[PDB]
Amino acid sequence: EAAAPAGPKEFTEVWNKKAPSTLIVPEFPSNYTAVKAVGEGQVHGDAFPVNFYTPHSILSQAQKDTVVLPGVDGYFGVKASHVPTIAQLKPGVVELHSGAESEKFFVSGGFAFVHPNGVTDICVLEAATLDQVDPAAVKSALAAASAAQPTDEFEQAANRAAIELYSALESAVEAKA
Amino acid sequence: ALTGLTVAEYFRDIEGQDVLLFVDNIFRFTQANSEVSALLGRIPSAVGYQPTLATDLGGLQERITTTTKGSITSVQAVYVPADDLTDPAPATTFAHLDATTVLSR
Amino acid sequence: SIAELGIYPAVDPLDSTSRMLNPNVIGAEHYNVARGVQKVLQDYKNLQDIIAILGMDELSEEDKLTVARARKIQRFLSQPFQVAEVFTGTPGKYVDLADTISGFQGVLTGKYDDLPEMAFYMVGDIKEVKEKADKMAKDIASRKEADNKKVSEELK
Amino acid sequence: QGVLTGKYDDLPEMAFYMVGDIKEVKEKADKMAKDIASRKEADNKKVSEELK
Amino acid sequence: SIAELGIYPAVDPLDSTSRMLNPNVIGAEHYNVARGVQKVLQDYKNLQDIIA
Amino acid sequence: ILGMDELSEEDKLTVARARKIQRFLSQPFQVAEVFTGTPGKYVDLADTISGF
Amino acid sequence: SNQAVKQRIRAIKNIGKITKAMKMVAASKMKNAQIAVEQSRGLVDPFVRLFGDFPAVNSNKSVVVAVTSDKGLCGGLNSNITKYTRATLATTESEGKDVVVVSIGDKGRSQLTRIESQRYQLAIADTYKVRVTFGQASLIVEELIKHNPQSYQILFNKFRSAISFKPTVATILSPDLLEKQLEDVTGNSLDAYDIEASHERSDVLRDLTEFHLGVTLYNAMLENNCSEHASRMSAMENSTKSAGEMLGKLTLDYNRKRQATITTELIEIIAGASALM
Amino acid sequence: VGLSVSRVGSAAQFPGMKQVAGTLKLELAQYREVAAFAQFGSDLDAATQYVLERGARLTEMLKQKQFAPIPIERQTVAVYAATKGFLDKVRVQDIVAAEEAVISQVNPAVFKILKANGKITPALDAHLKAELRKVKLPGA
Amino acid sequence: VGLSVSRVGSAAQFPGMKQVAGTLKLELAQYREVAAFAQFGSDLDAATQYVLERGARLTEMLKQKQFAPIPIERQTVAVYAATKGFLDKVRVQDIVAAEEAVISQVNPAVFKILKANGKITPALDAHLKAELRKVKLPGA
Amino acid sequence: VGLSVSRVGSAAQFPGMKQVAGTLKLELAQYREVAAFAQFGSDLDAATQYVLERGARLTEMLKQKQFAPIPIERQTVAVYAATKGFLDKVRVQDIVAAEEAVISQVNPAVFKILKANGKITPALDAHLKAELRKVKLPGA
């Protein structure tokens, strides 16, 4: 049931009647969004558009053919037309593929959507590629993390996040192929 | 400046040529005539120039013309006092200028 | 400079004086609104170079009120004359004294802060501000009403 | 030389006003900071009562 | 201008001059603190326009 | 304050015309070839109008 | 007399120098803080591609944020946002609801605590003091989910160009309160997505709308900072041309008073000498 | 146009020119309210683009070259074509050509009618507006 | 106030006004000190905004009408009531009204003993601070 | 510097100074046009901050105490040591041991050669650049 249809078209009339007529109607982030979810397209075969995102940088916006993402239930590959999903991610390696060649960014968390028009959206807070990490620091940081376990369970939640991320990173650096 | 105008006026009126006349600092002509009329006891006009400023300038600047036998053209260096174009000596001199060549640093 | 604004008669409100501007001759209700109008116009004159070199964008909202009210009460000193109607065409306006005192109390207290500035220009009373303010809002709406064409008059 | 090189940035700014030596700005700061430490009691037994 | 700030004696510290203000006359230690006070006062006089 | 890269192509075409226009206003004089070697040019008015 | 207009000319001349310096300081600050704005523009659109854009919802508790600037030479920006803030705040208030109004930047607290002081619970300043980062926006968003509203209206200036700064309103719905319900049509529009997370969808949507509030708040203050620098770059340009027109008028007035002074002093001397000669 | 006055010869104006010159200088008067802040001063509202691109065409209508003075009946026809909106579609760059095309293309009977009657009579505005739509103004 | 000087200063005025007027002269210097810093609205640390009302209340205290001079004891009561407390909870708009509340409603016997002493004795300072709290100030 | 002229100019200066001071007056002019930015906190694009620190050390280069004039070969060397980039680009706690340290620590043979030849030859700016790098300032 959708008898109360909020939206950019349906904010405009209540604004034009209530707000003063000197002002132009305020913009919306939907006006700056060119591609959407429900309206189909964007696949045209074996390609599908991958938008890999961080708050500080836009890591990829090209089209790919498979991406493997570290979900909470383990890794999973997204082919050209996956089922629509909202997959929470755990610390692991996001791997893009455009063909024979691949780029592997290690991520810290985040989510990953793929939409009913086949466009996928990987939304993480910090993604550093495996060249940028040195393995001598993650071993000592996990040693300092898996040692001190305070009884204040906020800090043990932070410790669990630490040992999860550092352990998946350590397994992510001997996993060269 | 009248001596220079006479030597140019020979080449205009007799030789029948197109003469240049370089009056280096028409302002110093104005300033010298201001000093002369102050020494003759005359009352200065506006800011301190001679009362006869327009006609002392026009005595020079009206003999620089094209006649039926020749012409005198005149490139006059202009000094502007206190960076003020409305000072009456450049305001009077600019009334006679037909062009302006500004050399910049 | 007041005449270069277009405000006629170009009476400087802060350079004109009278010995009748005294509460013991004109009464305190006239004297207080006159001194209030002079206070607002001086307090706008004190902002005149800040508004020039910075703009109105940065002023305090208790002073942007002062600037708008003084831009109103210095258009409300403008008045069409019966002798100036031959070279302007706008008819003359004689304003009684009590009309001016009530009309200048109203802009001071804030009873006309919604009317635009140009609604006060070259009108007689504060009543005629109201019939000019809405006539400015017909004529921004009468742009989109009709498409006037004239037919079948070549045989008239 | 003290106020120039910076020995006396720990004194308040109006402590230097209408004083003598450098030994008087230091104690005018003490009087100013005992007096801005004071004026905190306001209830009663001040001069305003009548049987005082 | 100094007296409108309530600072008395209203001596302009910059516009005042003396023949004795020489490092050979009153000593270089006095001369350098005098020139340093005038330096910081001229710098503040130049900074007031961007402060306002 | 911004840069020549953000300019329009017609707001770089006026720059590319004006630089060679102000270069084409230069002229070597006949009275300077005594001590600068480059011979001097006398340009006619007909050449000047067409060349600009 | 003729000394006051000389030092006034000097004052206006140095003010013109100051504002011409501030113009290109803001030009440099806009040129470097523009790439960060375009980089942060990417992450806001997967959520509006997923959750959509629902400004005209009916909520009962709503937090409205006006993203303003800190320094006050922006030239018509923070006043524009406090216009649009109450212009959309009166548009979506007709239900007898609760509203918390928050400002980012203390020039918002100087402008919002006099226009809605009944509803103003939070003032957040010093945000641009070094740079805006995502953890900073995350802490601000956690202070916003300290209250438990049903919606979040975010008011900011989108850096459209170096001259145009479109003021936008971005809306974030609370998960269990309106997010599942504003997607209901013929079932639900979110049921096409297969949740691959740990717990149930009432926590996935909680994490997603907290993330979405933080992301749009990061992009809000980042876009608003770039438009604040770009409008200061134009306001200081107008200030230099105004203090140049004022200098060009006051120099003519000085030259007139200069010529008048030389003439009247010389007329005094001649009048004193003609009485004796 | 703001500072210049002539209030004695305003009674002694050519009628017809007096009819159109009222809305001419009123349109230029509200054009002078758009002076140095079209998008120079602070911003743009862009609803007064009509008075901006109208006052520009009224300004370049009144430009005139040297040593060529215009008869009054051809001036009032040119400013009638300017201020009734008959040159509203023409771009700003060729109104100098548009108004001389108006003078050369509109048939010279209406100039004699306007000079002899001395006013834009109700018989004359109809034939003037019929003549003013059938001319080819350059550009556009 | 900054430009009007006097050579005698003290020793030639009322002693009771001399107690209460130096703290007015210097406080108006503080009030003028912040007027060139009131065009922005930063309002530093409740100091440059507190004296911005305190001195503004003092300059409203100093206003008076024409042909109506005040006796000196009523002036040094009315400026006692301003540079001390008793008026900071009053709007700047109506201190000229609040001063007649201070002058009239206070017992007219404190004026006689302030005139006859010449200064504000601590015996009289107590009753003066007492009767400056009993009156009704109209500020709302 | 900007208002002091000499209409004779470079035709009558030291030829060893003429090839060093032509840089000096140019970058002093560049420092004079960028003179408001010295009082700013927001650093600009380091083509202006470079000329800001350079012009500041150049104005501090031309300071001079009274009744102690300098020979022309020593001024040339001290200006060469600030226009060629041998500047105190350290923190400036060592103003006390670096202004005079250049002319006191280079060997005086370069002064004899520069005075007798009147020009910094390619055979002498080599030794002067080699001498300028080995300046001690051992107070640090």
Short mmCIF file of N, CA and C in Angstrom, two decimals, chain B:
data_model
loop_
_atom_site.label_atom_id
_atom_site.label_comp_id
_atom_site.label_asym_id
_atom_site.label_seq_id
_atom_site.Cartn_x
_atom_site.Cartn_y
_atom_site.Cartn_z
N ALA B 1 60.28 77.34 -26.73
CA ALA B 1 59.33 76.61 -27.56
C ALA B 1 58.91 77.43 -28.77
N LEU B 2 58.88 78.76 -28.63
CA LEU B 2 58.58 79.61 -29.77
C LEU B 2 59.76 79.69 -30.72
N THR B 3 60.99 79.59 -30.20
CA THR B 3 62.15 79.48 -31.09
C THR B 3 62.11 78.19 -31.91
N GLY B 4 61.77 77.08 -31.27
CA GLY B 4 61.60 75.84 -32.00
C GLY B 4 60.46 75.89 -33.00
N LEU B 5 59.36 76.55 -32.63
CA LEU B 5 58.28 76.74 -33.58
C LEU B 5 58.68 77.60 -34.76
N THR B 6 59.57 78.56 -34.56
CA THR B 6 60.01 79.37 -35.68
C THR B 6 60.89 78.59 -36.64
N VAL B 7 61.79 77.77 -36.10
CA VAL B 7 62.64 76.97 -36.98
C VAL B 7 61.81 75.93 -37.71
N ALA B 8 60.74 75.43 -37.09
CA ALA B 8 59.84 74.54 -37.82
C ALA B 8 58.96 75.31 -38.81
N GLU B 9 58.62 76.55 -38.50
CA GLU B 9 57.74 77.32 -39.36
C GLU B 9 58.45 77.79 -40.61
N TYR B 10 59.77 77.90 -40.57
CA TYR B 10 60.50 78.11 -41.82
C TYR B 10 60.33 76.91 -42.74
N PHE B 11 60.57 75.70 -42.23
CA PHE B 11 60.46 74.50 -43.05
C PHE B 11 59.03 74.24 -43.50
N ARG B 12 58.05 74.73 -42.76
CA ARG B 12 56.67 74.63 -43.21
C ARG B 12 56.35 75.68 -44.27
N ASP B 13 56.52 76.95 -43.94
CA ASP B 13 56.02 78.03 -44.77
C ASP B 13 56.89 78.32 -45.97
N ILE B 14 58.18 78.06 -45.90
CA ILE B 14 59.10 78.33 -47.00
C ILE B 14 59.44 77.06 -47.76
N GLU B 15 59.96 76.05 -47.07
CA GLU B 15 60.37 74.83 -47.76
C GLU B 15 59.17 74.01 -48.23
N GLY B 16 58.03 74.14 -47.57
CA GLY B 16 56.84 73.42 -47.97
C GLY B 16 56.91 71.95 -47.65
N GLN B 17 57.17 71.62 -46.40
CA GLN B 17 57.42 70.25 -45.98
C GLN B 17 56.42 69.81 -44.93
N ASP B 18 56.58 68.57 -44.48
CA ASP B 18 55.83 68.02 -43.36
C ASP B 18 56.81 67.89 -42.20
N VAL B 19 56.72 68.81 -41.26
CA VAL B 19 57.73 69.00 -40.23
C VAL B 19 57.23 68.37 -38.94
N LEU B 20 58.12 67.73 -38.20
CA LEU B 20 57.83 67.35 -36.83
C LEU B 20 58.38 68.41 -35.90
N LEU B 21 57.77 68.55 -34.74
CA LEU B 21 58.26 69.46 -33.73
C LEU B 21 58.10 68.77 -32.39
N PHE B 22 59.20 68.48 -31.74
CA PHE B 22 59.17 67.76 -30.49
C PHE B 22 59.33 68.79 -29.38
N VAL B 23 58.22 69.15 -28.75
CA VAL B 23 58.25 70.01 -27.58
C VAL B 23 58.40 69.09 -26.38
N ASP B 24 59.63 68.96 -25.90
CA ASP B 24 59.88 68.15 -24.72
C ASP B 24 59.37 68.85 -23.47
N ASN B 25 58.32 68.27 -22.89
CA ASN B 25 57.61 68.78 -21.72
C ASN B 25 57.02 70.17 -21.98
N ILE B 26 55.90 70.12 -22.70
CA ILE B 26 54.91 71.18 -22.74
C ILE B 26 54.49 71.64 -21.34
N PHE B 27 54.55 70.75 -20.33
CA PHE B 27 54.34 71.18 -18.96
C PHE B 27 55.41 72.15 -18.48
N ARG B 28 56.65 71.98 -18.91
CA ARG B 28 57.67 72.92 -18.47
C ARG B 28 57.56 74.24 -19.22
N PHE B 29 56.96 74.23 -20.41
CA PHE B 29 56.58 75.47 -21.07
C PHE B 29 55.54 76.22 -20.25
N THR B 30 54.48 75.51 -19.85
CA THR B 30 53.42 76.06 -19.01
C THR B 30 53.97 76.58 -17.69
N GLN B 31 54.86 75.81 -17.07
CA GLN B 31 55.45 76.17 -15.80
C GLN B 31 56.36 77.38 -15.92
N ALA B 32 57.10 77.49 -17.02
CA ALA B 32 57.94 78.66 -17.24
C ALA B 32 57.11 79.91 -17.47
N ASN B 33 56.00 79.80 -18.20
CA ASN B 33 55.13 80.95 -18.40
C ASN B 33 54.41 81.34 -17.12
N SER B 34 54.12 80.37 -16.27
CA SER B 34 53.56 80.65 -14.96
C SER B 34 54.55 81.43 -14.11
N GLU B 35 55.83 81.06 -14.18
CA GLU B 35 56.86 81.80 -13.47
C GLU B 35 57.03 83.20 -14.01
N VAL B 36 56.97 83.36 -15.33
CA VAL B 36 57.11 84.67 -15.97
C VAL B 36 55.99 85.60 -15.55
N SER B 37 54.74 85.13 -15.61
CA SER B 37 53.63 85.99 -15.23
C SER B 37 53.57 86.22 -13.73
N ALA B 38 54.16 85.33 -12.93
CA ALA B 38 54.26 85.63 -11.51
C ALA B 38 55.30 86.71 -11.25
N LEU B 39 56.34 86.77 -12.07
CA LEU B 39 57.37 87.79 -11.90
C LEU B 39 56.91 89.15 -12.39
N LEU B 40 55.95 89.19 -13.30
CA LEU B 40 55.41 90.46 -13.77
C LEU B 40 54.33 91.00 -12.86
N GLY B 41 54.07 90.35 -11.73
CA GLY B 41 53.16 90.86 -10.74
C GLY B 41 51.72 90.49 -10.94
N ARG B 42 51.42 89.54 -11.81
CA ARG B 42 50.05 89.22 -12.11
C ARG B 42 49.49 88.26 -11.07
N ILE B 43 48.18 88.34 -10.88
CA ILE B 43 47.48 87.51 -9.91
C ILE B 43 47.28 86.13 -10.50
N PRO B 44 47.68 85.06 -9.82
CA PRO B 44 47.44 83.71 -10.33
C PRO B 44 45.97 83.36 -10.39
N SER B 45 45.64 82.49 -11.35
CA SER B 45 44.30 81.95 -11.48
C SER B 45 44.19 80.73 -10.60
N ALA B 46 43.32 79.79 -10.97
CA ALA B 46 43.21 78.48 -10.34
C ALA B 46 44.56 77.78 -10.30
N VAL B 47 44.69 76.66 -9.62
CA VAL B 47 45.63 76.39 -8.54
C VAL B 47 46.91 77.23 -8.36
N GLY B 48 47.32 78.05 -9.31
CA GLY B 48 48.53 78.79 -9.09
C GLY B 48 49.14 79.08 -10.42
N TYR B 49 48.44 78.65 -11.45
CA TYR B 49 48.88 78.95 -12.78
C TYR B 49 48.53 80.38 -13.13
N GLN B 50 49.16 80.84 -14.19
CA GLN B 50 48.94 82.13 -14.79
C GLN B 50 47.47 82.33 -15.16
N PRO B 51 46.98 83.57 -15.14
CA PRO B 51 45.64 83.82 -15.66
C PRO B 51 45.56 83.58 -17.14
N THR B 52 46.66 83.78 -17.85
CA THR B 52 46.73 83.66 -19.30
C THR B 52 47.12 82.27 -19.75
N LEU B 53 46.85 81.24 -18.94
CA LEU B 53 47.30 79.88 -19.19
C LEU B 53 46.75 79.32 -20.49
N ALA B 54 45.46 79.52 -20.72
CA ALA B 54 44.83 79.01 -21.93
C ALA B 54 45.35 79.72 -23.16
N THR B 55 45.56 81.03 -23.07
CA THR B 55 46.02 81.78 -24.22
C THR B 55 47.53 81.71 -24.40
N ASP B 56 48.30 81.52 -23.33
CA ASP B 56 49.73 81.27 -23.51
C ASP B 56 49.98 79.90 -24.09
N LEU B 57 49.15 78.91 -23.74
CA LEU B 57 49.26 77.62 -24.40
C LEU B 57 48.77 77.71 -25.83
N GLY B 58 47.68 78.43 -26.07
CA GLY B 58 47.14 78.58 -27.40
C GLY B 58 47.97 79.44 -28.32
N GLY B 59 48.87 80.25 -27.78
CA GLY B 59 49.81 80.92 -28.65
C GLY B 59 50.81 79.96 -29.25
N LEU B 60 51.21 78.95 -28.50
CA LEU B 60 52.07 77.92 -29.05
C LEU B 60 51.29 76.97 -29.95
N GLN B 61 50.24 76.37 -29.41
CA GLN B 61 49.58 75.23 -30.03
C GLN B 61 48.78 75.61 -31.28
N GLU B 62 48.56 76.89 -31.55
CA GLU B 62 47.81 77.28 -32.74
C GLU B 62 48.68 77.60 -33.93
N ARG B 63 49.98 77.76 -33.73
CA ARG B 63 50.91 77.85 -34.84
C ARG B 63 51.34 76.48 -35.34
N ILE B 64 51.05 75.43 -34.59
CA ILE B 64 51.27 74.06 -35.03
C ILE B 64 50.00 73.64 -35.76
N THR B 65 49.99 73.82 -37.07
CA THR B 65 48.84 73.42 -37.86
C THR B 65 49.29 73.11 -39.27
N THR B 66 48.36 72.60 -40.07
CA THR B 66 48.58 72.34 -41.48
C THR B 66 48.07 73.52 -42.28
N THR B 67 48.95 74.14 -43.04
CA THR B 67 48.51 75.20 -43.93
C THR B 67 48.55 74.70 -45.36
N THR B 68 48.31 75.61 -46.30
CA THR B 68 48.24 75.23 -47.71
C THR B 68 49.60 74.86 -48.28
N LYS B 69 50.68 75.28 -47.64
CA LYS B 69 52.03 75.00 -48.12
C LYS B 69 52.69 73.83 -47.43
N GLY B 70 52.37 73.56 -46.18
CA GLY B 70 52.95 72.44 -45.49
C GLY B 70 52.18 72.09 -44.26
N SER B 71 52.87 71.48 -43.30
CA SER B 71 52.27 71.20 -42.01
C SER B 71 53.37 71.11 -40.97
N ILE B 72 52.99 71.33 -39.72
CA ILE B 72 53.82 71.02 -38.57
C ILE B 72 53.03 70.04 -37.73
N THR B 73 53.58 68.85 -37.52
CA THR B 73 53.03 67.90 -36.58
C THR B 73 53.86 68.02 -35.32
N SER B 74 53.28 67.70 -34.17
CA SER B 74 53.98 67.95 -32.92
C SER B 74 53.78 66.82 -31.94
N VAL B 75 54.87 66.20 -31.52
CA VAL B 75 54.86 65.15 -30.51
C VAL B 75 55.34 65.80 -29.22
N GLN B 76 54.42 66.04 -28.30
CA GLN B 76 54.70 66.79 -27.10
C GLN B 76 54.70 65.87 -25.89
N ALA B 77 55.82 65.83 -25.19
CA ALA B 77 55.88 65.07 -23.95
C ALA B 77 55.02 65.75 -22.91
N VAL B 78 54.13 65.01 -22.27
CA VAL B 78 53.18 65.58 -21.33
C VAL B 78 53.51 65.06 -19.95
N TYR B 79 53.75 65.97 -19.02
CA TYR B 79 53.83 65.65 -17.61
C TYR B 79 52.52 66.02 -16.95
N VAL B 80 52.02 65.14 -16.09
CA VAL B 80 50.76 65.36 -15.39
C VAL B 80 51.08 65.53 -13.91
N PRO B 81 50.84 66.71 -13.33
CA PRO B 81 51.26 66.96 -11.95
C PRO B 81 50.32 66.32 -10.94
N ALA B 82 50.91 65.68 -9.93
CA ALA B 82 50.22 65.04 -8.81
C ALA B 82 49.25 63.95 -9.26
N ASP B 83 49.55 63.33 -10.41
CA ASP B 83 48.74 62.26 -11.01
C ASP B 83 47.30 62.70 -11.24
N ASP B 84 47.13 63.96 -11.63
CA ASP B 84 45.84 64.63 -11.64
C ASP B 84 45.58 65.14 -13.04
N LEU B 85 44.71 64.46 -13.78
CA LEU B 85 44.42 64.90 -15.13
C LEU B 85 43.53 66.13 -15.16
N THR B 86 42.86 66.44 -14.06
CA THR B 86 42.02 67.61 -13.98
C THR B 86 42.77 68.82 -13.45
N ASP B 87 44.06 68.68 -13.17
CA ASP B 87 44.92 69.82 -12.93
C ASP B 87 44.87 70.71 -14.16
N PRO B 88 44.75 72.03 -14.00
CA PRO B 88 44.45 72.87 -15.16
C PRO B 88 45.55 72.96 -16.19
N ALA B 89 46.77 72.56 -15.89
CA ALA B 89 47.77 72.58 -16.95
C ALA B 89 47.65 71.37 -17.87
N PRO B 90 47.53 70.11 -17.40
CA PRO B 90 47.19 69.07 -18.36
C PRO B 90 45.76 69.11 -18.84
N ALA B 91 44.82 69.67 -18.08
CA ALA B 91 43.47 69.82 -18.60
C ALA B 91 43.42 70.82 -19.73
N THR B 92 44.27 71.85 -19.70
CA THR B 92 44.35 72.75 -20.83
C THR B 92 45.15 72.16 -21.97
N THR B 93 46.21 71.40 -21.68
CA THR B 93 47.03 70.85 -22.76
C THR B 93 46.28 69.77 -23.52
N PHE B 94 45.46 68.97 -22.83
CA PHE B 94 44.70 67.90 -23.47
C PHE B 94 43.63 68.42 -24.40
N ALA B 95 43.24 69.68 -24.26
CA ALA B 95 42.29 70.27 -25.18
C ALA B 95 42.89 70.49 -26.55
N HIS B 96 44.21 70.55 -26.65
CA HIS B 96 44.87 70.76 -27.92
C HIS B 96 45.43 69.49 -28.52
N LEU B 97 45.51 68.41 -27.75
CA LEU B 97 46.10 67.17 -28.24
C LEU B 97 45.14 66.45 -29.15
N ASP B 98 45.64 66.01 -30.30
CA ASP B 98 44.84 65.24 -31.24
C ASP B 98 45.09 63.75 -31.14
N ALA B 99 46.06 63.32 -30.35
CA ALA B 99 46.33 61.91 -30.16
C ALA B 99 47.03 61.74 -28.83
N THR B 100 47.38 60.50 -28.53
CA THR B 100 47.98 60.17 -27.25
C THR B 100 48.76 58.88 -27.44
N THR B 101 50.04 58.90 -27.13
CA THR B 101 50.89 57.72 -27.21
C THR B 101 51.42 57.46 -25.81
N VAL B 102 50.91 56.43 -25.16
CA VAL B 102 51.30 56.09 -23.80
C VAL B 102 52.34 55.00 -23.86
N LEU B 103 53.54 55.30 -23.39
CA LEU B 103 54.59 54.31 -23.25
C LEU B 103 54.55 53.76 -21.83
N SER B 104 54.43 52.44 -21.70
CA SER B 104 54.32 51.79 -20.41
C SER B 104 55.63 51.11 -20.04
N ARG B 105 55.87 51.00 -18.74
CA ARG B 105 56.96 50.16 -18.28
C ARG B 105 56.61 48.68 -18.43
#
